[PDB]
Amino acid sequence: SVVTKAIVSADAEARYLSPGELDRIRGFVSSGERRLRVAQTLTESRERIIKQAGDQLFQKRPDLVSPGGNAYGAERTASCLRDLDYYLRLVTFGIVAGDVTPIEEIGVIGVKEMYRNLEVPLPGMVEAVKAMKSVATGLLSGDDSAEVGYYFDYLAGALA
Amino acid sequence: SVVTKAIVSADAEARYLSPGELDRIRGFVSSGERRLRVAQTLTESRERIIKQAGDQLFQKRPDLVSPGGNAYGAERTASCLRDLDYYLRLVTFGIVAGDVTPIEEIGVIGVKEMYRNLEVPLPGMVEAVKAMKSVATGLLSGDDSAEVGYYFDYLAGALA
Amino acid sequence: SVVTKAIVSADAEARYLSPGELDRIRGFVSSGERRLRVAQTLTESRERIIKQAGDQLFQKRPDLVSPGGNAYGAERTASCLRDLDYYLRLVTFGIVAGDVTPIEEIGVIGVKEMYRNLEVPLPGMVEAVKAMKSVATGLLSGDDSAEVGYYFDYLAGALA
Amino acid sequence: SVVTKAIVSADAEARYLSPGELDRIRGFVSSGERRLRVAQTLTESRERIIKQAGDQLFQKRPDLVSPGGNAYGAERTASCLRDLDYYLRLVTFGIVAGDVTPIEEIGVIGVKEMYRNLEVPLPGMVEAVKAMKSVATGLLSGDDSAEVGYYFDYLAGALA
Amino acid sequence: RIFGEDTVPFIRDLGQEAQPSWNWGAAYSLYNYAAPRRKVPQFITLYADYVKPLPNQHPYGSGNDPLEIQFGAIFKSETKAPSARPAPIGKDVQRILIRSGNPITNERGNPAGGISDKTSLSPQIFKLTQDNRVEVNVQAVIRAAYQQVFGRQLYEGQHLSVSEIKLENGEISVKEFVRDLATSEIFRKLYWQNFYVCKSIEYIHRRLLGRPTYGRDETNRYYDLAFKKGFAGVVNAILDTMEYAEVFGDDVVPYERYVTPAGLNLRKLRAGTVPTL
Amino acid sequence: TRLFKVTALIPSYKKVRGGRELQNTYFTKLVEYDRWFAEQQRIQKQGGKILSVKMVAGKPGLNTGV
Amino acid sequence: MQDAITSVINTYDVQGKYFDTSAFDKLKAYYATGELRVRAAGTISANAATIIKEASAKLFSNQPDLVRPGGNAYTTRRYAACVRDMDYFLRYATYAMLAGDTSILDERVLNGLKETYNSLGVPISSTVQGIQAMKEVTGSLVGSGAAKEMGVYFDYLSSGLS
Amino acid sequence: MQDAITSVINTYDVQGKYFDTSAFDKLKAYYATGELRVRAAGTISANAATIIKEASAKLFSNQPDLVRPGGNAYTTRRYAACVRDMDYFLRYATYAMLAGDTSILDERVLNGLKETYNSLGVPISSTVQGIQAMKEVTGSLVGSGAAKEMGVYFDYLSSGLS
Amino acid sequence: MQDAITSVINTYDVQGKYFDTSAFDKLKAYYATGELRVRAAGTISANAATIIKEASAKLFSNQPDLVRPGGNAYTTRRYAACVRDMDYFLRYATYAMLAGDTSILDERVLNGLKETYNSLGVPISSTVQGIQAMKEVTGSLVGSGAAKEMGVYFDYLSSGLS
Amino acid sequence: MQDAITSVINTYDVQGKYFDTSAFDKLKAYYATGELRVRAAGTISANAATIIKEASAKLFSNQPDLVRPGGNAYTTRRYAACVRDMDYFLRYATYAMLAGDTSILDERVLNGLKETYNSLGVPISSTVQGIQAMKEVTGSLVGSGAAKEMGVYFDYLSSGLS
Ligand SMILES: CCC1=C(C)/C(=C/C2=NC(=C\c3[nH]c(/C=C4\NC(=O)[C@H](C)[C@H]4CC)c(C)c3CCC(=O)O)/C(CCC(=O)O)=C2C)NC1=O
Ligand SMILES: CCC1=C(C)/C(=C/C2=NC(=C\c3[nH]c(/C=C4\NC(=O)[C@H](C)[C@H]4CC)c(C)c3CCC(=O)O)/C(CCC(=O)O)=C2C)NC1=O
Ligand SMILES: CCC1=C(C)/C(=C/C2=NC(=C\c3[nH]c(/C=C4\NC(=O)[C@H](C)[C@H]4CC)c(C)c3CCC(=O)O)/C(CCC(=O)O)=C2C)NC1=O
Ligand SMILES: CCC1=C(C)/C(=C/C2=NC(=C\c3[nH]c(/C=C4\NC(=O)[C@H](C)[C@H]4CC)c(C)c3CCC(=O)O)/C(CCC(=O)O)=C2C)NC1=O
Ligand SMILES: CCC1=C(C)/C(=C/C2=NC(=C\c3[nH]c(/C=C4\NC(=O)[C@H](C)[C@H]4CC)c(C)c3CCC(=O)O)/C(CCC(=O)O)=C2C)NC1=O
Ligand SMILES: CCC1=C(C)/C(=C/C2=NC(=C\c3[nH]c(/C=C4\NC(=O)[C@H](C)[C@H]4CC)c(C)c3CCC(=O)O)/C(CCC(=O)O)=C2C)NC1=O
Ligand SMILES: CCC1=C(C)/C(=C/C2=NC(=C\c3[nH]c(/C=C4\NC(=O)[C@H](C)[C@H]4CC)c(C)c3CCC(=O)O)/C(CCC(=O)O)=C2C)NC1=O
Ligand SMILES: CCC1=C(C)/C(=C/C2=NC(=C\c3[nH]c(/C=C4\NC(=O)[C@H](C)[C@H]4CC)c(C)c3CCC(=O)O)/C(CCC(=O)O)=C2C)NC1=O
Numbered sequence A, B, C, D: 001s002v003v004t005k006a007i008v009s010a011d012a013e014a015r016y017l018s019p020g021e022l023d024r025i026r027g028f029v030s031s032g033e034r035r036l037r038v039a040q041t042l043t044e045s046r047e048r049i050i051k052q053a054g055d056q057l058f059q060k061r062p063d064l065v066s067p068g069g070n071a072y073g074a075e076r077t078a079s080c081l082r083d084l085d086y087y088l089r090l091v092t093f094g095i096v097a098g099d100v101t102p103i104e105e106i107g108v109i110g111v112k113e114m115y116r117n118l119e120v121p122l123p124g125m126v127e128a129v130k131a132m133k134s135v136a137t138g139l140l141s142g143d144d145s146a147e148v149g150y151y152f153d154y155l156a157g158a159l160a
Numbered sequence E: 001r002i003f004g005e006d007t008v009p010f011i012r013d014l015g016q017e018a019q020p021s022w023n024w025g026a027a028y029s030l031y032n033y034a035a036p037r038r039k040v041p042q043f044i045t046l047y048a049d050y051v052k053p054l055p056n057q058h059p060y061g062s063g064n065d066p067l068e069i070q071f072g073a074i075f076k077s078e079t080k081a082p083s084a085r086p087a088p089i090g091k092d093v094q095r096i097l098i099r100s101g102n103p104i105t106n107e108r109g110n111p112a113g114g115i116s117d118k119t120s121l122s123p124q125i126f127k128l129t130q131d132n133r134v135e136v137n138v139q140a141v142i143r144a145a146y147q148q149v150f151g152r153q154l155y156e157g158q159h160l161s162v163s164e165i166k167l168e169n170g171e172i173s174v175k176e177f178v179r180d181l182a183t184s185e186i187f188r189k190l191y192w193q194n195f196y197v198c199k200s201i202e203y204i205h206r207r208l209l210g211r212p213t214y215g216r217d218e219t220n221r222y223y224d225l226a227f228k229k230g231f232a233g234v235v236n237a238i239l240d241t242m243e244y245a246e247v248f249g250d251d252v253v254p255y256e257r258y259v260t261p262a263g264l265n266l267r268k269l270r271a272g273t274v275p276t277l
Numbered sequence F: 001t002r003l004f005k006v007t008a009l010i011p012s013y014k015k016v017r018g019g020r021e022l023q024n025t026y027f028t029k030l031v032e033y034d035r036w037f038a039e040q041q042r043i044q045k046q047g048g049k050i051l052s053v054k055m056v057a058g059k060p061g062l063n064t065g066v
Numbered sequence G, H, I, J: 001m002q003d004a005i006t007s008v009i010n011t012y013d014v015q016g017k018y019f020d021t022s023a024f025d026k027l028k029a030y031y032a033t034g035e036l037r038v039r040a041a042g043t044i045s046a047n048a049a050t051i052i053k054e055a056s057a058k059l060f061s062n063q064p065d066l067v068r069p070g071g072n073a074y075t076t077r078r079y080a081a082c083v084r085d086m087d088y089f090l091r092y093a094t095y096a097m098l099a100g101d102t103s104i105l106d107e108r109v110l111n112g113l114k115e116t117y118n119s120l121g122v123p124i125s126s127t128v129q130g131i132q133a134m135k136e137v138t139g140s141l142v143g144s145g146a147a148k149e150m151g152v153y154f155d156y157l158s159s160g161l162s
């Protein structure tokens, strides 16, 4: 979270928190309810976001669900949608926390080794998360959309 | 090569070559003639090998040449077969060198970076390498087949 | 041995053995019968080789046995021949191992300071090992004599 | 600067700036307007602040301007007040920059050796900086008083 | 006087007439068909060097000094363009190095300047304090270690993964991680086996201690360590110096502490960064 | 004789430093045999106290394989 | 390194002057563009691999001999070095765009880069063309207002190599 | 570094070409010479101390000024430095002979040796004389066939110094 | 030397290719800027002594130490040498601007110049500052576009001395 | 580093000759002046800070622009570096005087100092003026003979820089 980031920076520099990051903490706690309402607005739209993103991904990449591809078959497409579920939940966690820390610590560290073990193509992941970004930004107003897109494109860059 | 690797392994500890290294070089220079014969037999028959290997690869992984695939289209398939020709040339270089060294520098360092910058799927590369190995071992006798198979196995594991 | 060196070199980069290391191990195990017959031949004629080596040393270097020398006296001559016994045993160890690591870490590592602590001239040691090489290569067959000679040359270069 | 420090941290790690670092820069550029207002207010009042702080210091520590004191005489008192003006300008630079880096570079690194070569007392400097903080914070608003006093206390600790 | 109206000029080298001694090597470099291949002037430089103190130079010549860039190990070559200046630098000559940080923290004036408090002039320091037995500081320290030892990140196949795992797990310290990097086969390939031995020693010294060598004491010591023990001997000896221990303990990644005036000139004298009048 | 397991206490006698350094004073680490003589010397230089040393990886008294 | 704020601070400190109207105008001009710079930096960070893709593909389409045998980028190792250098250029152009200053380009990138490339045999013209290709590819993603900002730093790098 | 095999491989790799009859002829030549090269390498490894012994003694006998006071080799330090340089020369000539290529000599020894010796005050004529001493000393030990092979690498070192 | 037209000709000749649309576009760009280049060159040639006067005055006013005793420019001979160096920098910047390429700058100024100043003890930083002074003085006389063009080559000289 | 005794030892070792009467005469002269040297060194050590204070005060009074904005000694950092350099010069001059040989100056002080200061931007002439002011201050404290002795080393430093 933002508080954790400020505390670890202070501890690394071995001094108390300055008025600047104290103001950072005040601003973060002042915006908590907006983060929670954004987290809901994403949460009711789980199925619509995930299914639209999967449809767009397999529109751009028919080879993935083509015979011989990674997502060929109903069960493997279900696993695709479940991975998108994981990443949408992680984006909600990041929005609530104020930074991307839950996103990496749960789904970015070691993701390349995991998906190499799973024959999962990383370009497919980045296209899927870009589709989820485009879908999720439409659900929100501009002020919410910008911050949510920050988490989404951080995740896209990390997957790439 | 064997000589190069032995010399660098000697130089790193500032010593003359040990009896084991000299014996290894002796074995290599004694096997040189059959190594050249293997390099022959792979070299003349390579239009065949490339064509059969590509056909087998695209049969076992139709997704690559399906719409949305990496090698979709005549020109990208041509680039695919060109890469196969590159790697089989590297294999003959390794056979004459007696080590996987020329393969390693020419086509293993940064290969993941390059096939990410091209989004060539590494599992497809590994499948193509196994296809080339099977086709090439088909045209060699058992003693030659094992030797060429070691280099193909190194290439496939490196791309994996 | 050869297997130990290949395994540690491969594990240095945390990787499986290269076809080069597999090939050197294969050549090592392929030649086990000849080197083990060499070990037979050397261990059967220990006392003869040791005696002629001592005689050749004493005639080549009358300095050591003359009064005031390191080898003057019956006990010190006995220690001389005892060290020759040790070193030919180490040569047999290296021959069966296929690498000079047993010789290295039994009789080579710290030998300089050791014969400094014994006031033993290192030129005397190299003359001893050259005499041992000559006597052993005289008895061995043409192909086996060279293989023994390379280990003896390693030992000679190691001492001084 | 905040931007300089974020860029240097990202460059040291050979990475792009993270969402947290961009968030810090976003907050900094948002607050830049009021920090410019604070700096301009502190700049317009330089004569009043320097004069009032100088009289407060000299009445609080008469021994500096007494005969035999460091600042005794018109020219030495002028040099005293000119150092005060230097540090006021440095505080304004820190205000605009968002951190104490301009202060450190221009007037904190090597300050003790310089004033030791000048026979200038360090407690006198610390009390002068404290008087400047009192005068400036008294003239300007309470909300900006904390922000300005942060840099003033940094300077007071540095010269202490 | 020498040629007159009717005689073609000739080279007046040894045996033709008396030869000057003060320009001997330069002159016989000039009376060579490879003289046009050298573009740096050699006589103005020589006659200026005869009347001036020693330059800021590696004790084995200017071709032994690498460019102070992030990565690469770029040296001047004697053969592509000679451009070679030899200097009679003795064994006790101590080079003048410039601090990458607080100027008065230089060890020549302040022997305790290595343990001095870091200013904002100094580079980023990476220290591992994480439980020394989820943390992003460990990965940051790993990347900083790769950035110092190699100057850059390596490709994925080249990572010392086992050493990294031991690093976040706490079995080894940052110093042991740096040692595993610097003694690795990849470091030997990149910075040892393709270079002149003293060039490799100089570059490795700069990567490991963060400063160029001071003179022929250090260069000769590491040269003899090369002679006796090889690349591993040199690298282990540099890491086993006391100076390393005071400046970089077991916890902190090495960083650049000193530069040469040429390396400073590379950054400062670019038209953007030159101080405007 | 490959790996030693060494625990030690190294107090600070030259400075008073305000960062976190509890990990630097008391620590248990694995040192190689070839590294251990120099490591023990360096620890004794700094005024540290060596509490326990144990052989871990290798086997004591190996004439070969070390 | 030196950014726009530090550049103004230094140019006034060397004069010994306090901030005047011109100084505050420069500081305002920097602070006004901060949101654009941060948004562009975020976009470039999230799309760096795509930018390198498209610039490399364009460069090796105009000059296919670079990646074919006998070319400087012909091997997996040298192709990796090429795309790595392009990534370095993109990262430092983003840094220079955030800073508002070209100083970091001079003191972390362009210092000795031309002579290093001359030593290595790296073709300078082809590298300048790759930098230009990164410039067009980035301009599409960031938008015109940020495209103009990235253009000056890409041109600074190109003139440094050239 | 580079040996004969790697030299042929790199030539055909830069040409993007295939191993033709000429390439296989060169490979056959190296494999034919390999056993002689290995025997010579082992012999030189056996007698390296002896070769340095005799070459140093002969060089200092032909030019006794070096070891008398005022000579470049007059001290224990400078004499040991001379012996260390000669031991490098022997070891690296042996490496080049076993490889069949002088690239290792170039990059590891000759790139920077002239300037090092000129800065140290080391005589280069006398160093070439010492290299020739090692040359004709090792020629007797390795035999005429192996001497003809090691001589080209000793002459390469001498020409690089001269 | 080499100019823009010769640069394009050489680039296409090494490839063995005939001119295509890109090469013709580059040639057309040079032909478009030729008239501006000629005007700027004539203006500079008319006012070279002036530009040297203000640049030297600026440099020696901001750094008076250079011309006091113990300074590098302290004598009539060394002051004349300094102003001669500035004159040559200006002339070759004009040559490069006319040619459109920095090849003459390298060949006739920058090859071996830093070594020469290092031997002579010339402060290269002060020389670069004088070059920057000549740049700003020249720009005012030549106008906006001519100033940008001339500043390209002045900055090339300054970075080359680096 | 070599003193008078070491210089005699080396000039007799290069010849290979033992000591004869002349060497003993030179050594006796050095011991004759040794008491003066030790007293001067002790006096200078006792008052190093004072000497630096008047020397820097005189230099900055004679050249006020140095410590004003735009001068090379305008910062606490740069002022501290300046007085640090002055301490270097005093300490190494004391070393050279105590050794009776100017070798240490060439050996540890004047080597690469011109290039270092020229890269930093330090005024060489003003540093020489600081050295001369330090000479004047040191002379009055050490007395006439010790001043004449220290003057040769101060003049050596000033001529080495200039
Ligand atoms: C919260 C962090 C987390 C993640 C992200 C995660 C991913 C993950 N995906 C898996 C399988 C899978 N994942 C995918 C999805 C991929 N297929 C491609 O077409 C798409 C580009 C892409 C999805 C957008 C597929 C097809 C599989 C089945 C592969 C197989 O079983 O062979 C599996 C193996 C378990 C299973 O088969 O159900 C894991 C662990 N696990 C975690 O603990
Ligand atoms: C921007 C960083 C910077 C600083 C801070 C700075 C301070 C500074 N103050 C100086 C003189 C002085 N400074 C003082 C000030 C002292 N008088 C009292 O004791 C007070 C405790 C104290 C001031 C509150 C005095 C009295 C002098 C005159 C010293 C003399 O001439 O003997 C000098 C000597 C040169 C000169 O007079 O111009 C410097 C360099 N210079 C810098 O470049
Ligand atoms: C003005 C300063 C100056 C000096 C000093 C100088 C020395 C000098 N000595 C030379 C030859 C020589 N010099 C000597 C002298 C040495 N032989 C030893 O026995 C003795 C220790 C010593 C005589 C005392 C010899 C023997 C040669 C002939 C070298 C040869 O041709 O083989 C040569 C080359 C021939 C020529 O002059 O054209 C030079 C240049 N040249 C100069 O311009
Ligand atoms: C951030 C977490 C952290 C903690 C908690 C910590 C405690 C700590 N205290 C230490 C020394 C010490 N600690 C004390 C304090 C004790 N003296 C008594 O009078 C008091 C009852 C008591 C303090 C209230 C003293 C006196 C020493 C010096 C060692 C000695 O001489 O006994 C040391 C080792 C030596 C050193 O300072 O380098 C540590 C590691 N270090 C850490 O990094
Ligand atoms: C000798 C070392 C070396 C190698 C190996 C190498 C490979 C290489 N392959 C490329 C493109 C390609 N490579 C492939 C191959 C893929 N198609 C399928 O996905 C398969 C999984 C796989 C082949 C089995 C394809 C389709 C392209 C074209 C990509 C595009 O259209 O942009 C390119 C880009 C430029 C070009 O095509 O010439 C390179 C440089 N270059 C080298 O210097
Ligand atoms: C961060 C500042 C910095 C930079 C930028 C830098 C450039 C640089 N590029 C290098 C290699 C390379 N760089 C390139 C890229 C070029 N050649 C291709 O044709 C392209 C046209 C072009 C890129 C667009 C290539 C192909 C190599 C391989 C050359 C070799 O290794 O011999 C190397 C050699 C060291 C190594 O590869 O590890 C350096 C030092 N060094 C630095 O310290
Ligand atoms: C000033 C420093 C210095 C020293 C000391 C020194 C010693 C030295 N001893 C030498 C040979 C020798 N030294 C000795 C002495 C040994 N014989 C017995 O074993 C004794 C144990 C011992 C004497 C007590 C002998 C017999 C030789 C002749 C060896 C030979 O000719 O091969 C040589 C070779 C002479 C030449 O090549 O012309 C030198 C240079 N050199 C120096 O620059
Ligand atoms: C592996 C490539 C490599 C080589 C070869 C190399 C040579 C080399 N030789 C050196 C010293 C030396 N080398 C020699 C040898 C010469 N003088 C004698 O007269 C002979 C004619 C001749 C040898 C046959 C001597 C005498 C020194 C001592 C120089 C001195 O201490 O001033 C030194 C400097 C040691 C120091 O700092 O004092 C180097 C670097 N360096 C390298 O990186």
Ligand SMILES: CCC1=C(C)/C(=C/C2=NC(=C\c3[nH]c(/C=C4\NC(=O)[C@H](C)[C@H]4CC)c(C)c3CCC(=O)O)/C(CCC(=O)O)=C2C)NC1=O
Pocket (backbone or CB within 6 Å): E096, E097, E098, E099, E103, E104, E106, E108, J066, J072, J073, J077, J078, J079, J081, J082, J083, J085, J086, J088, J089, J092, J108, J109, J110, J113, J116, J120, J122, J123, J126, J127, J130
């Ligand atoms: C014992 C041999 C030796 C000398 C002489 C030496 C001088 C020296 N002075 C330096 C900085 C400096 N030196 C000065 C001194 C100047 N300021 C004024 O103009 C004066 C005229 C003049 C001094 C009287 C200044 C201001 C700096 C700071 C430069 C900067 O930070 O940009 C530096 C670079 C920073 C560092 O200390 O690492 C060196 C190396 N170093 C040595 O190892």
